[PDB]
């Protein structure tokens, strides 16, 4: 019927626009709106929870929901860094859809949370089908919490760690050495008294580069939260310049848009250092 075929076409429209995300924020926002349409949402500019009744968290939708989580994160991380309110709004949207991506991909997880099993323990049971969900949920949750402040961040630390621990168990190479890149940031951002460890950070960051030397986002995160922490101006400067100098064809085609964002982030950090007299 009209809506089951309008959801099949909007899924097609969503995927098409997400593949064209290198064109700019518009295509990203077009992808999100089509997915949300296919997920039964009324259209609009407010939080999903105000427009999306009973999103279908079924196995056949799990891939879509984890991709929606990544895409809303991509929008905020790429385009809202200058706008704290919007950035916080949209990272929380990605968290919201990420919770539904986890439920859809993992019946055991959905069952566990209904028997009052706490996330910390439930997340450890998610199978390979849920790795995209749990990785992009943790990415959105971490960046949302970080922007909110220390109280929110430390409140989420143990659930984040359990999530990334499970992702690393399932596949340390997922999304270009993602679980290792994530832990590099985790151990650099956390203060020592909250579990921070520069040795574990560098170890994880290096393992990520060994698995995916082309992933420029690893070096951006190193410069941003480690080189600053280590008060190593030379390394901060070097990492960012290596990012900016990297050739486009060094990374796989399917993440060219992400790498372009990371080069923009490096230029932005270069100008922040000058402006705020870092180092």
Ligand X SMILES: CCCCCCCCCCCCCCCC(=O)O
| Residues within the interface to ligand X (CB under 6 A) | 139, 142-143, 146, 153-154, 157, 160, 175, 178, 181-182, 185-186, 189-191, 194, 217
Closer CB to ligand X, 11 or 119, in the complex: 119
Smaller CB separation from ligand X, 100 or 176: 176
Compute the distance between CA of residue 104 and CA of residue 99 in angstroms, rounded to an integer: 9
116: left (phi over 0), alpha (psi -120 to 50) or beta: left
Of 48 and 142, which has the nearer Cβ to ligand X?
A: 142
Helix and strand element counts for the chain (H, E)? 13, 0
What string of DSSP letters covers 216-238? HHHHHHIIIIIITTTT-HHHHHH
Q: Which residue lies nearer to ligand X by CB, 146 or 273?
A: 146
What is the number of other CB atoms lying within 10 angstroms of the CB of residue 237? Answer: 15
Name the minimum Å distance from CB 164 to ligand X: 9
CB of 185 to ligand X, least distance (A): 4
Tell the smallest beta-carbon distance from residue 253 to ligand X (Å).
Answer: 17
CA distances 57 to 100, 137, 205, 221, 252, Å, are: 6, 15, 34, 33, 31
Give the nearest distance from C-beta 107 to ligand X in angstroms: 26
* Closer to ligand X by Cβ: residue 39 or 246: 246
Q: Give the separation between CA 18 and CA 21, rounded to whole angstroms.
A: 5
Minimum distance of ligand X from residue 139's CB (angstroms): 4
Backbone φ and ψ of 172, nearest 5° = -65, -15
């Amino acid at each position: 019927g009209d809506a089951t075929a309008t959801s099949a076409s909007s899924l097609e429209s969503a995927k098409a626009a997400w593949e064209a995300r290198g064109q700019g924020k518009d295509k990203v926002l077009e992808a999100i709106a089509a997915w949300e349409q296919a997920m039964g949402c009324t259209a609009g500019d407010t939080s999903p929870k105000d427009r999306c009744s009973a999103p279908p968290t079924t196995t056949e939708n799990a891939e879509t929901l984890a991709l929606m989580t990544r895409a809303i994160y991509f929008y905020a991380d790429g385009y809202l860094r200058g706008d704290e309110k919007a950035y916080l709004d949209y990272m929380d949207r990605a968290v919201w859809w990420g919770e539904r991506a986890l439920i859809a991909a993992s019946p055991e997880f959905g069952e566990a949370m209904r028997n009052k099993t706490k996330y910390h323990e439930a997340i450890a049971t998610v199978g390979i089908a849920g790795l995209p969900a749990m990785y992009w949920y943790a990415t959105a949750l971490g960046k949302w919490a970080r922007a909110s402040g220390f109280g929110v961040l430390v409140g989420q630390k143990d659930d984040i760690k359990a999530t990334m621990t499970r992702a690393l168990e399932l596949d340390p190479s997922y999304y270009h050495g993602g679980p290792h890149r994530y832990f590099g940031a985790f151990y650099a951002i956390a203060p020592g008294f909250a579990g921070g460890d520069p040795d574990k950070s560098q170890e994880h960051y290096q393992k990520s580069l060994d698995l995916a030397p082309y992933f420029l986002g690893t070096k951006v995160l190193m410069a941003e939260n480690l080189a600053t922490k280590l008060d190593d101006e030379e390394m901060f400067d070097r990492l960012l310049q290596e990012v900016i100098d990297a050739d486009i064809s060094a990374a796989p085609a399917e993440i060219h848009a992400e790498m372009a964002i990371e080069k923009e982030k490096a230029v932005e950090l270069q100008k922040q250092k000058v402006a705020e007299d870092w180092f």
